[PDB]
């Protein structure tokens, strides 16, 4: 069979499933961005942009 480092080559001649895989990657990246923003909002302290701005946190 295919070795483990080649499993995704099944997409090379399958444009529709390539689009599907690219869609899933895009979904994962967009979900990371939303998740990351929510985590930061749950931890960010906005009370002092002078001595505790976002880049200290």
């Amino acid at each position: 069979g295919l070795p483990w480092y080649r499993v995704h080559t099944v997409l090379i001649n399958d444009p529709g499933r390539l689009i599907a895989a690219h869609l899933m990657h895009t979904a994962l990246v967009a979900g990371w961005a939303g998740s990351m923003a929510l985590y930061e909002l749950a931890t960010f302290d906005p009370s002092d942009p002078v001595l505790n701005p976002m880049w200290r946190q």
């Binding site: 906005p46 002092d48 001595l51």
Partner: protein, 122 residues
């Protein structure tokens, strides 16, 4: 032209103090020999400001706006007391009784809730 409870109920007007027309720019004479009282004192708050708690003592803290979250339950009303004429012609209101307190919760930017007993007791 006089409103009933059923005219007012649920409108929010019950939390509002009476107003006077723009024509009411007169003068009410005080007879230093007469005794007076305030038959009704009403206080309708429109803004609640909270002083921020700063980390820097060199920094002068300011009063910031807040959001009222306990609805139209804030006004003081039906307050009465003596209105004394003092020897120097000044007047002193001495509060006696009435609905002279309201618990109020306002919310600061970021979510911190500030309860207070808004009052003119005594």
């Amino acid at each position: 032209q006089t409103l009933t409870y059923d005219d007012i109920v649920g409108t929010g007007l019950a939390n509002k103090c009476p107003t006077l027309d723009d024509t009411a720019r007169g003068a009410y004479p005080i007879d230093s020999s007469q005794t007076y009282r305030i038959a009704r004192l009403c206080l309708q708050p429109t803004t609640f400001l909270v002083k921020e708690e700063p980390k820097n003592k060199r920094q002068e803290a300011e009063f910031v706006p807040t959001k009222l979250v306990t609805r139209e339950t804030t006004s003081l009303d039906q307050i009465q007391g003596e209105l004394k004429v003092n020897s120097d012609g000044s007047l002193t209101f001495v509060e006696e009784d009435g609905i002279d307190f309201q618990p109020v919760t306002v919310q600061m930017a970021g979510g911190e809730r500030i309860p207070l007993l808004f009052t003119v007791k005594n």
